[PDB]
Design an enzyme around this catalytic site. Sequence first.
Site, mmCIF file in Angstrom:
data_model
loop_
_atom_site.group_PDB
_atom_site.id
_atom_site.type_symbol
_atom_site.label_atom_id
_atom_site.label_comp_id
_atom_site.label_asym_id
_atom_site.label_seq_id
_atom_site.Cartn_x
_atom_site.Cartn_y
_atom_site.Cartn_z
ATOM 1 N N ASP A 94 0.847 -1.182 0.000
ATOM 2 C CA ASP A 94 0.000 0.000 0.000
ATOM 3 C C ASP A 94 0.891 1.243 0.000
ATOM 4 O O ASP A 94 2.091 1.161 -0.269
ATOM 5 C CB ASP A 94 -1.001 -0.052 1.157
HETATM 6 C C1 LIG Z 1 7.305 9.269 18.125
HETATM 7 C C2 LIG Z 1 6.105 8.416 17.720
HETATM 8 C C3 LIG Z 1 4.836 9.263 17.756
HETATM 9 C C4 LIG Z 1 3.877 8.781 16.673
HETATM 10 C C5 LIG Z 1 2.523 9.462 16.843
HETATM 11 C C6 LIG Z 1 1.830 9.587 15.493
HETATM 12 C C7 LIG Z 1 0.862 8.433 15.289
HETATM 13 C C8 LIG Z 1 -0.240 8.864 14.322
HETATM 14 C C9 LIG Z 1 -1.160 7.683 14.042
HETATM 15 C C10 LIG Z 1 -2.586 8.183 13.853
HETATM 16 C C11 LIG Z 1 -2.755 8.734 12.442
HETATM 17 C C12 LIG Z 1 -3.696 7.818 11.663
HETATM 18 O O1 LIG Z 1 -3.801 6.689 11.982
HETATM 19 S S1 LIG Z 1 -4.653 8.436 10.253
HETATM 20 C C13 LIG Z 1 -6.051 7.322 9.949
HETATM 21 C C14 LIG Z 1 -5.696 6.333 8.843
HETATM 22 N N1 LIG Z 1 -6.897 5.645 8.412
HETATM 23 C C15 LIG Z 1 -7.751 6.249 7.414
HETATM 24 O O2 LIG Z 1 -7.465 7.297 6.952
HETATM 25 C C16 LIG Z 1 -9.025 5.541 6.950
HETATM 26 C C17 LIG Z 1 -8.860 5.025 5.524
HETATM 27 N N2 LIG Z 1 -7.851 3.988 5.529
HETATM 28 C C18 LIG Z 1 -6.496 4.268 5.090
HETATM 29 O O3 LIG Z 1 -6.218 5.374 4.749
HETATM 30 C C19 LIG Z 1 -5.434 3.168 5.125
HETATM 31 O O4 LIG Z 1 -4.177 3.749 5.325
HETATM 32 C C20 LIG Z 1 -5.388 2.321 3.849
HETATM 33 C C21 LIG Z 1 -6.649 1.477 3.699
HETATM 34 C C22 LIG Z 1 -4.185 1.382 3.972
HETATM 35 C C23 LIG Z 1 -5.231 3.216 2.623
HETATM 36 O O5 LIG Z 1 -4.383 2.637 1.687
HETATM 37 P P1 LIG Z 1 -3.088 3.523 1.201
HETATM 38 O O6 LIG Z 1 -2.156 3.722 2.367
HETATM 39 O O7 LIG Z 1 -2.386 2.775 0.098
HETATM 40 O O8 LIG Z 1 -3.531 4.879 0.711
#
Ligand SMILES: CCCCCCCCCCCC(=O)SCCNC(=O)CCNC(=O)[C@H](O)C(C)(C)COP(=O)(O)O
Lengths: 312, 83, 193, 84, 157, 228, 253, 85
Positions: free
Chosen positions: D40
């Site tokens: 991905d």
């Molecule tokens: C020092 C350490 C500190 C870290 C803190 C930071 C952590 C931040 C984590 C929170 C941010 C999020 O999760 S953001 C939320 C992410 N989830 C969504 O947006 C819903 C839609 N699903 C997607 O986007 C998926 O990634 C996918 C299906 C694989 C799309 O495939 P691709 O990818 O090919 O595009």
Amino acid sequence: MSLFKSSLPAGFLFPYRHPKAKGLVEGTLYGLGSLFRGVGAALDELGSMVQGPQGSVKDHVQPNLAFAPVHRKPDVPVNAGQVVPAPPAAARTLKIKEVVVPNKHSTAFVAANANVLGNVKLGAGSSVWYGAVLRGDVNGIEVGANSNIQDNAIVHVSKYSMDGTARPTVIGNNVTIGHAATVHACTIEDNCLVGMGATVLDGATVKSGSIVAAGAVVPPNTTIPSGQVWAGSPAKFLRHLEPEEASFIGKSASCYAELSAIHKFEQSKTFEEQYTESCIIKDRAALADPSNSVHQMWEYDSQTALVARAKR
Amino acid sequence: YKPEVPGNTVDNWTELRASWNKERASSLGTNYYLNVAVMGFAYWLNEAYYFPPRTLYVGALVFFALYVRKAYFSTPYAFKHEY
Amino acid sequence: LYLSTAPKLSLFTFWASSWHHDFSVGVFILFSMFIGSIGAYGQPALRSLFAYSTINEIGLLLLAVETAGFHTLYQHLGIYIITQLLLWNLTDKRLFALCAVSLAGLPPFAGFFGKAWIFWHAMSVQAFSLLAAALFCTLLSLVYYLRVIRLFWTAPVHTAASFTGAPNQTTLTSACAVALAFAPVMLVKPFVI
Amino acid sequence: GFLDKDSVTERVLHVTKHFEKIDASKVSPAASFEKDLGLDSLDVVELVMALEEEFGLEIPDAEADKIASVGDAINYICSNPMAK
Amino acid sequence: HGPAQTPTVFDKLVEVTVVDMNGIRHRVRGLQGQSLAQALVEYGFPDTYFFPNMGFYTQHIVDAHVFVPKEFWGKVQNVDPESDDGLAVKRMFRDIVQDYQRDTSFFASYITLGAEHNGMTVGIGPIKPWILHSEWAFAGVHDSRNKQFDKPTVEIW
Amino acid sequence: NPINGLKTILHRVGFAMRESGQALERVGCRLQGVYSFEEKLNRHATVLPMRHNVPSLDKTSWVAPSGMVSGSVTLGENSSVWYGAIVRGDFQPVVVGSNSNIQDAAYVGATSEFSGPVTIGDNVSVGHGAVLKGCTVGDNVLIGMNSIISEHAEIQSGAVIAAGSYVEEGTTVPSGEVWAGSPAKKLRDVRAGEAEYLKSLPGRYTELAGEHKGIMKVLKMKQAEYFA
Amino acid sequence: GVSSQFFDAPNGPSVKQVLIEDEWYNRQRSIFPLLDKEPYYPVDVFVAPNAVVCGDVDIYGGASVFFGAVLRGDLNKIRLGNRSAILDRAVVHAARAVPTGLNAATLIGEKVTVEPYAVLRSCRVEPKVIIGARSVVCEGAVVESESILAPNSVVPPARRIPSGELWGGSPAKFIRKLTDHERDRVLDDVSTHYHNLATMFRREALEPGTAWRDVEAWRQKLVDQGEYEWINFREQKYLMRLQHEAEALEKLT
Amino acid sequence: GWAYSGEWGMLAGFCFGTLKNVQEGKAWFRRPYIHGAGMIAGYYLFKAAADWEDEALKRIITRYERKGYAIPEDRKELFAANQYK
Ligand SMILES: CCCCCCCCCCCC(=O)SCCNC(=O)CCNC(=O)[C@H](O)C(C)(C)COP(=O)(O)O
Ligand SMILES: C/C=C/C(=O)SCCNC(=O)CCNC(=O)[C@@H](O)C(C)(C)COP(=O)(O)OP(=O)(O)OC[C@H]1O[C@@H](n2cnc3c(N)ncnc32)[C@H](O)[C@@H]1OP(=O)(O)O
């Protein structure tokens, strides 16, 4: 209210003309200046006499021909310009009761060296550029809103022709007339473009959304239909309009509106403002030295070169 | 007619690049060492003005023959990691 | 412009007025003349050209000091100072060629006279070796003064006008100092002594 | 062409090899990140960051977003004038 | 002579991709017979990218440090390293580039644009601080929006 | 010509006296504190002499204020130079006959290095924007608008040059013929109804020049009200 | 519509704007700037009194602008080469962009003569070129060095005239090749001839002349009547900027 | 000193004015008051130089005779003379 609004001397505030002298020293200098002016003009006149017949031609300011009248004729109806009463000196001297001056909208721009005379109407936001000749003397000239007549273009009309037809020149809205174009007793419809150096002759019609190319000669009594480009001497059919050229015509009209704004801003400044601006340019170039001794105490306004505030 | 440039363009341009891949030193060291050499040891030539002219002329030619030019100077010691 | 004129005059006047030494300066004459001439031949930047040509000129002034006869020293220094006043205030680049022909010692201009009394007094007291070195370096100096003439005389003329006033503000001094072609009538006489 | 097309290729394979979600023998010199290798967007970003770590560069978001293949990455590194 | 094509500017156009020192790719169009440094100047690059050609009788020519790929190494013009032009290039490498030099380092005035350069990608190389005179120098930092094209003259004095 | 030598000496001496006087008047203005001399107004001259060569204008001829004549220019009886028109005789002279019109923003001149003088005949219409370089024009000729007539070309009497045409160098255009094209060529003969309008054309311009001269006089009196 | 007041002009906003129909004498400058775009010219230039040079224009060496000619650098830059002549009422303009993608500035090389009523817009003219009268060279076109364009010729946009040849017509076609003596001497001869004529005009010019005496007499009469207004232009520009800043601040919040 | 030094100074002043015009792009005859001021200054400068000629000769003969170098009276007129040669 810069910082010294109540302590600057009058020579600094009024560089174009100093106020009246008060003391003995200033009056002595003023009298010496008047004597020097008299002797200098006398020596100039004597040198012109010794020079010969070329010295009889003198330096004179030129009339404002950007807004100029023509004779009101009884056979010529006034439909573009306006009939205004004559001056009383002209009436009592050389028998003038009514003249015709142009009808100029307040947002239009006319170049100071252009020649716009008589029965001419200038629409809102329109522009006549440097060296253009718009002589409405035997018939009418109409220029629409947001139209531009560019540099060294000639516009003229006919009352007597070969075939006995009096024809005005009508120019529509959003029309661009190219550099050194000749427009003679013809009709230009809305949103058209006449190429630079082109010639449109008597009684020819350019329909809306068409382009006359550069260097083209439009023969008399020729109708150029909509959405066509004509070129050559004499002009024949060349192409249909592109999708982009129709928007290019409007882009050209908007660009000349924006340009006429800046040129009108620069042109309509007085002599006193221009001289003050030259003194400001001089002070700014003197302040561009980073070792200037005032930079450690005073902070200067960028646009006027006045002391704005104390730095420290 | 124009004469041909001798050689190959890649080889000539590598010759032009050679020994200049190095940061240039400031000139303060050369100037200070020159001033120290003159202010400390130029009094050694005071009696040389009275020496015979054949000796002085041969010494001048010897100094010219052993002189190394400061411009376009390079040493192989600049790019080696051991003596 | 300040550094090439005033302190040299001040220090040489102190030397003329209140200094005696029992030594020589001949090796520094040789070093200055050869180093200045070869350096100005080899350096393409114009500032370095004029720095090395200044070293050559101070070597000539030292030859005038070494053989006594401070009259030739003072004449050459005055002509050099007037040329410097012309050099650093130039706006028209055609007069850069007049500085070139008058710093190369070419005959009708005043630099020739300033060099030639130094050569005359050196030959009078028979300082032959230093004189021969001076003549060789004079032959070398002509090449880069010709480079100056090639750069700024055989070129199209462009001189930008002033916009913020002060229109070509030092044309008086530069045009007055170019009349070093009229001073040679007074230089040939017993004038500086 | 700022650098050769063989050593960069084996370096690309060398940094592609140490990925836990990739197959160490399925990797080919001309493949795809999406259909072939099954990655991905975040896995692609991680691989591009590994390539950046190995070659000492900086690839912006749009340029790394355009990279979708091993051949695309090799061509981008070869076309880069600041490669190591 | 017959019905053959009218000459267009598009027949003589050469396109070069240029990567500046921030990594931003640029599309640079030039004409055949024009040098590369001139096309770089007319594109609108800042004046901190350019420096005098340090030869005698050619300091009025502006020049730039470019990185050229190995395919286009043989289309740079040949310079004799024993001639005076060779010593000019040696002075430029000695003083301006110094330890930014690579095996792809050339100078842009020695590249004359032709059809063989069409599609060539070059990059702008970094340079050390330098001075010619008081009115033309470089302090070492590429923080200036002034274009080289907007300078009315190139002054050797 | 030693007469020109005496005229040259007198013109140079008078010019030096004029420079000295104007400079002293500017010093007087600076002493007064008035800086009106620094105004960048339009310094256009309708009549422009070239040293001792002054244009010779008839009392019934008219030159528009935006027009200009320079050097050795002769204007005949009831001949007109209109708005923006430039007639240049500072290198080689220009001779214009009687009842001939040089229309708005037209260029008539002899300034090339090998050009002869310009000779324009009687009752000649020179159209808008036409360029005339070192040519000879006979009587009763219409020069069409935006046309070019080159050096040593002869436009004989009664011929018509159409609009936008270009007559080459040293080209003789015969009598009573119409020529057109940029490599200009004979198109037809002049017709009789055409020739009637050709005969009636220059008188209209004469009366139009009279009306415009009167209006320009009104403008000059309006201007003179301000400073007098 | 666009306002005719500029508060970010380099010398400030215009305190007093004069309508053109209220002007009683012609005040057209020949060399003037447009906001921050100032013309550049040498000490020995000839600019005719009824010629207009405005905006971003660079003039070099012994170039000349003859009677009624316009050089308008408002959309881009214009450069006039050493000893290049712009003859009577020719127009030089420049577009903001050209179809070829190159620089859109009009660049004119040294020793280039442009015959009367010709128009140059966003074109490239190389050194030693004669442009004929009533000729138009369009946007993005290129005229190569040592070439001649016949009078009344059209060069369409993005077209090229090869070096060493004479071209003419609408559209421009091949006429003949120039001789070697024509390329060696004749082009320089034409440029030198027009420079000599410009020098003849430059010798006889009395600048600023004496036409200011009448206007000063009118102003003296106004000071006599007590109707001459003294305006503190620097202070009015300052106060107008302060009011503009206050008006801008009193609308965002 | 030299008899024709003032005329030389006037030619110097004329050339000075011509060069000041040529540097600023003007023809040679422009601003003739600059030529006149230059002529006056050149005349007086070269007359002062011609006076220094006689002064230098007088200083040389005076210093040489005080040191003990006795010059015959046929040769003292080469020095102690305001000669207008
Ligand atoms: C020092 C350490 C500190 C870290 C803190 C930071 C952590 C931040 C984590 C929170 C941010 C999020 O999760 S953001 C939320 C992410 N989830 C969504 O947006 C819903 C839609 N699903 C997607 O986007 C998926 O990634 C996918 C299906 C694989 C799309 O495939 P691709 O990818 O090919 O595009
Ligand atoms: C200052 C203000 C400027 C403006 O805003 S517009 C005012 C000035 N603008 C202009 O220059 C308008 C004219 N410009 C154009 O050329 C255009 O509009 C012109 C559109 C029809 C055409 O210009 P193009 O660049 O689109 O050229 P084309 O591809 O249409 O050319 C086709 C054809 O027509 C011929 N052609 C093209 N242009 C011209 C011309 N001009 N004259 C004669 N013949 C021409 C040409 O010979 C061509 O054939 P070949 O060259 O033989 O293959």
